[PDB]
Design a protein around this ligand. Structure first.
Ligand SMILES: NC(=O)CC[C@H](N)C(=O)NS(=O)(=O)OC[C@H]1O[C@@H](n2cnc3c(N)ncnc32)[C@H](O)[C@@H]1O
Length: 529
RNA sequence: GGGGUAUCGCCAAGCGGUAAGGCACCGGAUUCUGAUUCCGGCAGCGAGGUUCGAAUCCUCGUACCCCAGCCA
């Protein structure tokens, strides 16, 4: 329960409404991102929670910026997230002729007219945040003149920017939006759904209130920027022959630390190639978060955990993080992986290996146990090995012993180095019947695995407010290791995310992995203190 | 100008009845993952008025967001 829902129960009891009918109106000019998920939960959840209907509508009014590619993806992430829409997918373009008729109703009613101030001009007459606007000399043309001219615009008689249809509101209203907001505009650009049937497109403020109405929406839910815009949402509706009037309520938009979220800036990392793609695993996009290894639920949880308020906010990473972890900790079966590897030879080991039994999930044997190849020419993570270390360091010490994960207690007793003085091997001896702790991978039965260690894309908490967000990208947002994993990981089906013991939760990256060079993305690391 | 916001480090309840939970975080217990679990540990813009008493009320100021695209 949040204020929007609180309003919903009230609108219910009074009987202002019977069923709720919400909507998600993303424009198809980029992919969805976590923020949208917030928006996607609000509207889809309210509806199902109230046995209502939510639809997916692509507010495709600006042909020039939108592309078919997006609508396909927006459609997917929506499903993927876990929601289904009411009836078919509706496009604002579905209501184009509808908007046209309505523009005419305003014209005939005399509340809209063909203004001819060049764009530059239209702004000058607009006035400012403190100085009222000034009526255009065209403002008062006759209904007959307006109908004629509109039709011309529509018939392409005017070049782009040479004419526009405008409402006749109040040029000196404090709401800049009511200063004779433009209704239609000329754009000779093929629309992704109507092709070239249209030369004049309608504006969002115009399109949006009508679509909602014509759809039967009970609560147009949006983000705060559109609060001023509520004035014109009601005006248009309050001035055309349409039978319902969806009330609008806005809320705060999701802001995440260390990552921009504007479909534009995201769009910029993509175009200027600073990331693999909209879905590069470092992105805040859903497509990305998915490839990164986020479970629809963790996202839906995140969304649940941050509420919907009118307050400005900026969620920390640890929140989104805590979420995937809560999910994965409980579901992902553990495995063995070694990210940095130095060879460790147990000279006391005679033979060619054996077979150590490891659980799939230690706090839940319910997921059974697997069989992994133990040996004496194994691998380990360099950071487990130290010739010198304090009392808190629990891993391998030059004269100590560490219980190898699900196997034996070895005991380093020598070491060896090279040119630069870095070690190449740690000769040690294993105990006989013993079955701190560390993990490992038999070098022999080792699966060569590429590992992509990800980190927050941007170096600063609020790259948005930065001068050049690109200039503040973390060069270490991605760090490609080359490690070795037990042979089980051979059968990692791109999808499940295993938990490489003591390292993090990983998933096989489904944009690069091959039969021989599987690629495991680190969704999120573990809590290390 | 106008439209908004003002409770813990980050979110988020409470809507006059004497300040929820979440995440971060610091202690302690277990753990062949320094994880997991586990218990313990840390609060309402300012100033005034209003009440018996208000974070929720009235007023002043203060802050910070948004609005001068033929983008949405
Ligand atoms: N009346 C409205 O909702 C505005 C719709 C408009 N076409 C729009 O905002 N375009 S959009 O494609 O950028 O966004 C579509 C809808 O997604 C949600 N949304 C957009 N940006 C968001 C953000 N940063 N955080 C959370 N939710 C966000 C809104 O419901 C938005 O309308």
């Amino acid at each position: 329960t949040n204020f929007i829902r609180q309003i919903i129960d009230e609108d219910l009891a009074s009987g202002k409404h019977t069923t709720v009918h919400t909507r998600f109106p993303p424009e198809p000019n980029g992919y969805l991102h976590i923020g949208h998920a917030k928006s996607i939960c609000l509207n889809f959840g309210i509806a199902q929670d109230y046995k209502g209907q939510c639809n997916l509508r692509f507010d495709d009014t600006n042909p020039v910026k939108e592309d078919i590619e997006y609508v396909e993806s927006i459609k997917n992430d929506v499903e993927w997230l876990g929601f289904h829409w009411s009836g078919n997918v509706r496009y604002s373009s579905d209501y184009f002729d509808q908007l046209h008729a309505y523009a005419i109703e305003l014209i005939n009613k005399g509340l809209a007219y063909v203004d001819e101030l060049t764009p530059e001009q239209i702004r000058e007459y607009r006035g400012t945040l403190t100085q009222p606007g000034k009526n255009s000399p065209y403002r008062d043309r006759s209904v007959e003149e307006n109908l004629a001219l509109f039709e011309k615009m529509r018939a392409g008689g005017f070049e782009e920017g040479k004419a526009c249809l405008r409402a006749k509101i109040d040029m000196a209203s404090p709401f800049i939006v009511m200063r004779d907001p433009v209704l239609y505009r000329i754009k000779f650009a093929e629309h992704h759904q109507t092709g070239n049937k249209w030369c004049i497109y309608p504006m969002y403020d115009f399109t949006h209130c009508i679509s909602d109405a014509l759809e039967g929406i009970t609560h147009s839910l949006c983000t705060l920027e559109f609060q001023d815009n509520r004035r014109l949402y009601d005006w248009v509706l309050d001035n055309i022959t349409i039978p319902v009037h969806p009330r609008q309520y806005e809320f705060s938009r999701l802001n995440l630390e260390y990552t921009v979220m504007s479909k534009r800036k995201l769009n910029l990392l993509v175009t200027d190639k600073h990331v693999e793609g909209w879905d590069d695993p470092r992105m805040p996009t859903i497509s990305g978060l998915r490839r990164r290894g986020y479970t629809a639920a963790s996202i839906r949880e995140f969304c649940k955990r941050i509420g919907v308020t009118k307050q400005d906010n900026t969620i920390e990473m640890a929140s989104l993080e805590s979420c995937i972890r809560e999910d994965l900790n409980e579901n992902a079966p553990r495995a063995m992986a070694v990210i940095d590897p130095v060879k460790l030879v147990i000279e006391n080991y005679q033979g060619e290996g054996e077979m150590v039994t490891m659980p799939n999930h230690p706090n839940k044997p319910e997921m059974g146990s697997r069989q992994v190849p133990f040996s004496g020419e194994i691998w380990i993570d360099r950071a487990d090995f130290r010739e010198e270390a304090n009392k808190q360091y629990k891993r391998l010490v030059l004269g100590k012993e560490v219980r190898l994960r699900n196997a034996y207690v070895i005991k380093a007793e020598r070491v060896e180095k090279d040119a630069e003085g870095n070690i190449t091997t740690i000769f040690c001896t294993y105990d006989a019947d013993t079955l701190g702790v560390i993990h490992w991978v038999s070098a022999a039965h080792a699966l060569p695995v590429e590992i992509r260690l990800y980190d927050r894309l941007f170096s600063v908490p609020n790259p948005g407010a930065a001068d050049d967000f690109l200039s503040v990208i973390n060069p270490e947002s991605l760090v490609i290791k080359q490690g070795f994993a037990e042979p089980s990981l051979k059968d990692a089906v791109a999808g499940k995310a295993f938990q490489f013991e003591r390292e993090g939760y990983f998933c096989l990256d489904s944009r690069h992995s091959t039969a021989e060079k599987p690629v495991f993305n680190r969704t999120v690391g573990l809590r290390d203190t």
